[PDB]
Amino acid sequence: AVQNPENPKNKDPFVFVHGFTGFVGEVAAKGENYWGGTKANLRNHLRKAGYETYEASVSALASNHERAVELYYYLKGGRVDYGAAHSEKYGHERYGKTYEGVLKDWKPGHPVHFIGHSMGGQTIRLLEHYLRFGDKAEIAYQQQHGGIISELFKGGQDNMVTSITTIATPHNGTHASDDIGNTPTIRNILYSFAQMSSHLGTIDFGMDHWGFKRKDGESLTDYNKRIAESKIWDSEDTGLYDLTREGAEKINQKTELNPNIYYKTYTGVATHETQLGKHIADLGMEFTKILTGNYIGSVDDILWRPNDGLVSEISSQHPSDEKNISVDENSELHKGTWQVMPTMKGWDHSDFIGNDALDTKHSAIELTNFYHSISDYLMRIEKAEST
Ligand SMILES: [Ca+2]
Ligand SMILES: [Zn+2]
């Protein structure tokens, strides 16, 4: 229930960015709570503690490009514009929903702390890229064809993000997608259920820009014809591809460190070495992640075996080919470098957000103390920057 504070302890709002298959606010169901699960309401807790926070609402299955744009408009407000060139290339709708805007004042000089979990960490990085450099393809497209271009793709918009803090983010992708998720058979099943769900207006998987909604005065025949011919089934413009090792690396090659931003990663492991060097899921591993945790533990790439049930340790620690440094909670602050936090033994992909109801070992006060620590770290940054 609780509103943001009149007089907040932080001058830069904490913006939380959920991950793949994540739903927050009024696209969520009955009583599902992404940030906290059944164990805690982290929005209520942080705001009662005096902080100004927001939980961004972006597509569950869409690409990081889609989601990074949606994040911009979630904060700044307006009609989502995915880009004329990008949308033409991948063969989908250019315009999405329209958000009201929770921080219309968001501009250079009045920045934000971006905390992301899982795929949200990729989405944040991709947004900061478009803010700073824009997108050269979009500028070239509107130079060539005219029309309007989004402020976001124009670029030259710095000093809008203070810190980027990722939690169990597959910066380097995950075998879970390579070998399972983005397989033609699984992704067919998923996108088919999402289209059926969109058509029935039952659940918004954030993929309506692919034509899942049925147009006006359209026979069912035409509708089934458009969907069958949609470029979605083969497209690289999906979240599942961006969670692939190859697709994550495509993003890694786009992004570069901003010397004025504070970066930090939080990584979990919930597997243990066994016979032959294989890894198997700890007792307490979240139910739905047991299978993927076990698969990742047995892959050929030996260093990728330790994992949180979805993301390998070395994937979460930092993006490859980007400067990093080992620190802990008492280390001094560093700008422009990925501050790699010690691996948290016993924490799985879901535990980080309290979404493991069966795991009694992870209490509500432990989860609350973890986000306290993060926010204290963000207040250290604000203190260090003012002076
Ligand atoms: Ca667990
Ligand atoms: Zn797209």
UniProtKB/Swiss-Prot annotation:
Quote the catalytic residue positions: 118 (nucleophile), 308 (charge relay system), 349 (charge relay system)
Instruction: Provide the binding site for Ca(2+).
Output: 284, 348, 351, 356, 359
Annotated protein name in UniProt: Lipase 46 kDa form
Please tell me the species this chain comes from: Staphylococcus hyicus
Please state the gene responsible for encoding this protein. lip
Please state which portion of the whole protein this structure contains, as first and last residue out of the total length. Answer: 252 to 638 of 641
